Structures are given as C-alpha cells and as structure tokens.
Amino acid sequence: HFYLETNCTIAVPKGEAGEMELFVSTQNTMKTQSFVAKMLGVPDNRIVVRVKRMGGGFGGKETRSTVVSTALALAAHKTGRPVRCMLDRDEDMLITGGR
C-alpha cells in the first residue's frame, strides 16, 4: 500500500471499569473496537476507538491495523499507562501484508 503514514495506535487506559480509548490510523473503528474488547474480555461499551484522519489507507488499514492496536491495547491494560506504537516502514511492509 505504501501509505505514507504507517500503522499507529495510542491506547489510553482510564483505570475505571476496564474503560480504554484508542487513537488509531484505521479504516475500521468497529473491528478495532471488537478485537480489543474480545482480547481484554470486556464488553464493547468499554472501548472507544477514535480516528481523526489517516495518512493513507488504500485497504491496508481495513483489517491489518488491528495487529498493532490489539498489542498496544494489551500493554496499556497491563501497565495502566498510555502506550504508543508507530511502525517503521520495514516493520509495516513485513507485518501488514499487501495485494
């Protein structure tokens, strides 16, 4: 895809009732929300996914963004601290697949 912005998530744990807010470069807020919820074992109503804009998607952020989002969500849940990951180009090209 070579979206000029690679995949990126910030997960912010609120420390109440398993509430978490994610800021994500994704075309798919819904599945991002579902896959985080399911992994943590909390209901969908605890998880908010926010997207202002993406520096490109082209389909490559329709599902494969979640492999970053889930990992980050977990780290935030375990530490109780905000956690961030933005992939380097090499990581993105390797992990996220293509046409």
């Binding site: 399911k38 970053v68 905000p82 990951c85 390797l94």
Partner: protein
C-alpha cells in the same frame, strides 16, 4: 496519530516478529532485553487476559503460541519508556526455533 502529544507517563511498544516461515517456538530468552535501560516488560500469549484468537475469521493469534507461521508473525511486544529503548530491548529478545 503520532503528532498527538505524549502523556508524561506514556510508554512505547515494539513488536517482536518471527524470522522463520514455519517453525515451533522452542525457547524465548529476554535476558539481554532486561538490561536495556527503560525496559518495562515483554508481552506474549500468556499475558492475554481473555482470548488469543483474533482476525476477521478468528483464525489468527494476537501473539504466537507454540508455532510461527510466517516471517513477520508477531510473537510478542517489548514495552519500554522510549521507542529507541524498545527497539534495543526487542533486539535482545532471542528466539530459538525448530523448522
């Protein structure tokens, strides 16, 4: 997403990925990762609270469990104070494989 200012308590994540197309994970050694300044933890399948089963058709792992199935298959995530320290700690995660 990455232009969003960091919280003062924010941590960085770096993914650790399989270097084999198909192999059993024999052992994981984080001993060198722990020495990298600012290292917080290495997340693996064991740290998943509810379900390690993800993806649109539920046939994907969040984190590899026992076997890796592509070069790039996510095994785990290093958490550290900075992204430079996460990259360094990630290099100190040595994985042993059986093809």
């Amino acid at each position: 997403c990455d232009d969003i200012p960091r919280y003062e308590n924010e941590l960085s994540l770096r993914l650790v990925t399989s270097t084999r197309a198909h192999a059993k994970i024999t052992s994981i050694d984080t001993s060198e990762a722990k020495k990298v300044p600012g290292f917080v933890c290495f997340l693996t399948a064991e740290d998943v609270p509810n379900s390690n089963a993800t993806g649109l058709f539920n046939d994907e792992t969040v984190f590899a469990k026992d076997e890796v199935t592509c070069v790039g298959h996510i095994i785990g995530a290093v958490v550290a104070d900075t992204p430079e320290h996460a990259q360094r700690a990630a290099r100190g995660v040595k994985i042993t494989y059986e093809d």
